[PDB]
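Usage example:
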Amino acid sequence: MKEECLREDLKFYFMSPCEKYRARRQIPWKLGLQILKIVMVTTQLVRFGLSNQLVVAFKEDNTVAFKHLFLKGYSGTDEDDYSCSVYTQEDAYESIFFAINQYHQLKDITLGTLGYGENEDNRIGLKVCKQHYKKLNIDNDVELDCVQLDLQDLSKKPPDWKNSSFFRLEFYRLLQVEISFHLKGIDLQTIHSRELPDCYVFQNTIIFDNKAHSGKIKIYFDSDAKIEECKDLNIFNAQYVLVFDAFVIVICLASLILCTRSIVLALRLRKRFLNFFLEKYWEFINGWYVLVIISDLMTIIGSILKMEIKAKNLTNYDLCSIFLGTSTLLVWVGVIRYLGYFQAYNVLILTMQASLPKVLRFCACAGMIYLGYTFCGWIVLGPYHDKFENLNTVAECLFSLVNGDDMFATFAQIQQKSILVWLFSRLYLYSFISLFIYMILSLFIALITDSYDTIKKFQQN
Amino acid sequence: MKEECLREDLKFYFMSPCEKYRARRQIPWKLGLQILKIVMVTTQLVRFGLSNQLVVAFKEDNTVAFKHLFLKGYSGTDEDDYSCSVYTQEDAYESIFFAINQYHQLKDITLGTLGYGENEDNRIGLKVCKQHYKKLNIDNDVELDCVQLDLQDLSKKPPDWKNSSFFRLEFYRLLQVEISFHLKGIDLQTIHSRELPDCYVFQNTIIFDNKAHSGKIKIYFDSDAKIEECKDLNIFNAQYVLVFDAFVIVICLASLILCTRSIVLALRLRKRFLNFFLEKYWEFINGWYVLVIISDLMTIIGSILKMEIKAKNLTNYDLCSIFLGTSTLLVWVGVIRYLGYFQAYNVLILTMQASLPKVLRFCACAGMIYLGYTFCGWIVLGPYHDKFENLNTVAECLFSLVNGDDMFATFAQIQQKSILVWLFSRLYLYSFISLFIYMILSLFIALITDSYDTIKKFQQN
Amino acid sequence: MKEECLREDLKFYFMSPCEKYRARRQIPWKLGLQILKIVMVTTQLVRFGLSNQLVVAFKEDNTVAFKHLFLKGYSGTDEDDYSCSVYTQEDAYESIFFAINQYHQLKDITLGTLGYGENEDNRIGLKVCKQHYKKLNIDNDVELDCVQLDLQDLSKKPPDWKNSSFFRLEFYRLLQVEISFHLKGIDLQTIHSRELPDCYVFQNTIIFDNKAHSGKIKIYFDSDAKIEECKDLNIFNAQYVLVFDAFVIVICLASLILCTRSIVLALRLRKRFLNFFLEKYWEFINGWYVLVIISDLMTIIGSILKMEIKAKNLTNYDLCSIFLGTSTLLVWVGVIRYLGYFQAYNVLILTMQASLPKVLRFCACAGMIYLGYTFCGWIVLGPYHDKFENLNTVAECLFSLVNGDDMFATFAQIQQKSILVWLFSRLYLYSFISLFIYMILSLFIALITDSYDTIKKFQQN
Amino acid sequence: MKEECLREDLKFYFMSPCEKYRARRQIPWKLGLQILKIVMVTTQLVRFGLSNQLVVAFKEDNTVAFKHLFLKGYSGTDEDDYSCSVYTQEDAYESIFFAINQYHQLKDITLGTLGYGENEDNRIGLKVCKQHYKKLNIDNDVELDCVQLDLQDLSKKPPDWKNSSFFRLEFYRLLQVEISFHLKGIDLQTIHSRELPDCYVFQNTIIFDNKAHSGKIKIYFDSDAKIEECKDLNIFNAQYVLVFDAFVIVICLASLILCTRSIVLALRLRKRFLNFFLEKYWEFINGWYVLVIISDLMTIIGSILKMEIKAKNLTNYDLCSIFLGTSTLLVWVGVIRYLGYFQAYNVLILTMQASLPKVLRFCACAGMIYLGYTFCGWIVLGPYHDKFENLNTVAECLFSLVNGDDMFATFAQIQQKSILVWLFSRLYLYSFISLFIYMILSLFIALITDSYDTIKKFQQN
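Running the assembly step on the lines above writes:
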């Protein structure tokens, strides 16, 4: 009865986990442990999110306060990736001297627990560095002159730094001016929970940048904040965030072992049935377990990166957040496997499998037209439209137009000063919107719907 | 002929109310009284809306005028949930002293019928309360020091309060400063209808809040207005809004009794027919009457809450407005029952009943993907996007993206300073929009349309 | 052969106008004359539009210049239906005195061909009128005190009007202050075409309005411009716009006579065929000619109103523009009749006729839900959302939401200060969007498409 | 066996290029050379785009700096096509004198490598030209008075030009005032790549324009920048962009010869088969090759225009960019031909061919309604809505409304001051949106989908 054994095993392989508890009466660990994964991974993600939100909020608020304190005539919103700009030789001098003078008077201007930090040389002071082209008769070599203005020099009642030869900034040869200083802060919004609060160090840099030499000096403010140790503080669990992460690793490591077992054992079952079929005369490979394995790997990597982040007091979580969020997404998506055996919960996945070939084939022809339109729009409307300035911006604009978004602003944001470009823009926009939206969206939704219809008629036969 | 009786009663149960006037020639109270409900409930809602609009408008305009009078350099729009903000120790002093000095000179600055009210202690004056951390060497206990500045102290020509030790606000230990005062107003826009006008009392509080200790002091203005009695006024129907509400209660109470009778009597008819069916060999439960009962209950509760609100002169109608509006919505929706027997007016409800199982089953699988995307987007794009800052904001953004709204702003509002987060954002957004919109919306509309098609072919057979 | 005659006439009645030129070889006046109508009506509309655009542009630019000249601290954009606002008793005095002083110095401030006009009393001067409640101890009777400030009084070097008792404006009793004056302008942008240019008279009124008595005085500027005769001008065809209008009237009057003939003669043909059908054993009423008759009537009324407007030099064209535009719309729509006989150009009208019953029946049930949602949203979200402030605004917002517009701004523009209203808003918005968009739009498009399918299968059989 | 030869040739004509390598074993030049075209044309377009982006960026930044330097009280954003505006006779004088005085002090105000250029007369100076109506008693002849203010006149310490009779600008007769000057710049952002940098000359013109005579003087700033030769510069490949363009011309010229050969030879094959068919008893014309020929012609013209642009140092690329972008679009679109023989990659083109007749016929009837609505909306809502101001703006707004864009802003941007126009606007907007979106989009998508269905059933039979 080896054929009996083989066919009974094949019957066991395809029955629902509920039915696998009737065929052989065994506990479904790969379902309870997966529910545990969902719960624990979601809790970990939410708690990580809340904590890093607090840290990011503190850093951003301090940066905004720094910009108000040190940038002259700062509205409150950044003009661009740069914060301020100046167009006159006297406005630039005013901005530079304002920054230096506001540094000099920090203790009487700041509304927070700020102080004077220390550079690598361990001195409380300010560094100003200018870059010029060496000398109409200019060379390509950049001269770099730096000065270190200490608080005792700045404090001098008849100040001398203002009349020094360093601050005579020939502007036709000037590339940039940098002001760098260090500040120490204390997060007092944590002390309400009995603890030693977090101490920060801010590496603040102000760049007055005219690399373009086009009349505008762009002013950049960058603050790099790191958590240091509170060396001067007297206020009259990391352990329990490292054991919860260890638990998540344990659950995910177990799920990797169970799922890898199934994938290996499923392949052996296919071998046993293929050999018989050749003797007498994909439904074996489960891609959901391939998804679970990737989820587990990403969760383990994210938990390890998060433990490393907390252990050495880091403040950059972009990679760890990406791993944790993608793992949580994949966990919630893999929940669908435990509703897919159900007789009326699988229309979506079946339709996706049906569609995928036809959908991919369709997107090839539409992709070529989309790429041609992207290149044409970037080359023609790029100088005259801000939704067509960069190739990725053109792609995003075209995708949104296919989804019918900002169609009137896109039409109306082109100026009629050039009539040729305006006419071309009208022709371009009406040809893409018409062609793409109507024809291509019709034929794409129609393919999906006919795949869904084919899936439902098999279900009904 | 007991079977004759039973089958005649079953014929009576399913015929249209117009036909029930031919089978047994009886008045359809449950239709005329329902039309009366529609008319009267809509009139009540509209009149309530107009009156509470007038009251809310007065209160909001007074609040805006208060903000202009007392907040220094107030643009006219709130920055956030807070009204103003300051970043310098001298700006905060200027704001505080400006508020106190503008209170001192209210009679010569206000453009309205304002006056000086009285606190619980029954004295015309101003209260300033500061909160500090008790003392670098700070404790967790918050010291609370308050002063009461009366108009006679403020009026003193060489004022002394400005140089007092209370207003030396150490800012590294400061949590918040509160200014509280009372003002009395008169609504003169009502006197044009011969009456004694409405007298208001405003509990105004200004909070200079730096609980974050991040360099910015947020300034909150809150005005709590209550209607008092006009004790000093000589200007040379509540009854008819309490009898109209009583009429609405009477009509709704009658409708509850009639509809509860039907539901009970319908169950008895089912018993009489089930017993026979077992002898010889839901269409009895009406969910529209279950909706009418809830409508009547909500209308009665709303009318009682509104009568209570007017009787003790309250100015908060959120709960009463919710009850009245939901009752009106349900009344207009239950109007459809009296068009559902019609042979060609019922396609919508029949399609809803057909779809509901399949639609609910479909939304289970799509819901898991939606939740995973919500968590992933909040954890990754939350620090760098304002449409992903909170989990409910992520949900709203994703729902709007499924409906194709603000797709280019969502794509373009992420800064390319971090290239990893930017690339992940692009992948995330294109995967959700593509997957969800195209596949899921196709399969959802297709299910609804096939349910509609099945409903129409039964109608045609 | 009376039956031969009748059936030949019935054959003649339904053949295309091209075929009517073969059956009986007669000129199709009702086609050439209709093409003439299209051309001439469109030319008339375009020319009217251009001329009234010029006039409106002049008037609006003068109004904007008046607002800048006379409104103190005018940004350039109106805050609301009012232009400016003030919150202090000194700001209102400053605004009033600024308006009067800028009137006094008009000849040295204006950048145009402006001058001092004359009131009904024929005096160059300024009128200031204040309204107070007659006198805490205020009455309901409004006292109206007016003063007339002539340029000779204003010109006096030690002015006296500023210290007069008229400008002591008790603000707790004040309703409004009005400043009225007359200015004369000349449109010099017309003189470049040899003519006597257009002379205007501006009735300017500035209202400082505090009818609400809520602390804000709203400032309204209204300028009423009329074209007068140039009595003082020496610059070193109405006939041909009144004969073109007469031609349009003639063409439209002829079309009314021809189309009324057909409608009458068509009814006689129906009588002759109905009588025979009863003897032996709508396709007669043409609704396109009913549309042509309305088009002709509206065109004649619009042309007469436009001739009247030009004849007495009026500057309000809202009614005439409405008539002309609707007539042009209906003319272009009635062009479709002369493509409807074509065998493959009539799918749209046939589908509309098929759908209309079912579409109307469907919109009845959806209309009740829409009205209930409108009332609920206005009553609940009205105080807290500006897209739900008025009932028509609620209707517009709901219609746009059904069309998927501004869904994220609608979700996010509700403040979470009230949690009950916020939760209700979320439930409300997700229930309408879901229900209406998905189910109702599906069932509406499906009805239209099935009507189109039924129309095409008859065409194919 | 001439029939054998003919039928073998006809078999050869329709087999895929891969199969043409089996039938006769020949190299497919028209595929490899087309891939070369794709690669080389895309590289040329991208490189052209990057270079012209750099040039345009420099010119725009210099223009923005010029506006800040010379326009008094310049916010930073243009109000309209004009930059600034003034409403007072003293504001215009201030602006004019500010422009002249900022020109006088350019060397101490500019943040860049700017200098004083020279006019055609070869003198460093400023030209001011005013236009007046010759003289209430004004004539139609425009007097033109000009002055030339040289730096030596401007430099005079007790300046005299300010009190000259030229700057007494009677404003009721004034048409415009022009200030023209020349500046020389150097692009130093190029020197970092060892080269002689680019030298520019700016023809700057400031027009204070009151042609409307409506109280506002519009201020226009226009800067015309051309690349001159660096005559005064000592900084201590065009060849390789002209050989890459020549290569692109060579590849495109070869593709024209090959494709023209096929089109001619295909016609001969049709003749040989038509003659036989008549003896015994479009699939010959390839429109893809007609597209390739146009692509090649446009690419050659664009490359020649770009070589001409670089050869004489031009800075206008609108025509060349249009040619290059359209050629690249058409190249990427013609890539689809080499996926069209594939058995499941041609659904899109087949559906387009099927649909096109029906789609064109449908758009005729919808076009008439669209044109009527456009005219009606422009004539009625034009004075009161900025999305209906011009006929093309009306068309764009209506197209976006059909695509469901900005529906609430369109509804809400009409003011209720005129109730007739407001009611008409509501009726107009709800009738177009309803009719067009629902009915017309349904019938258009339905036609496309039924064409797709007919194409798929032939494929399956």
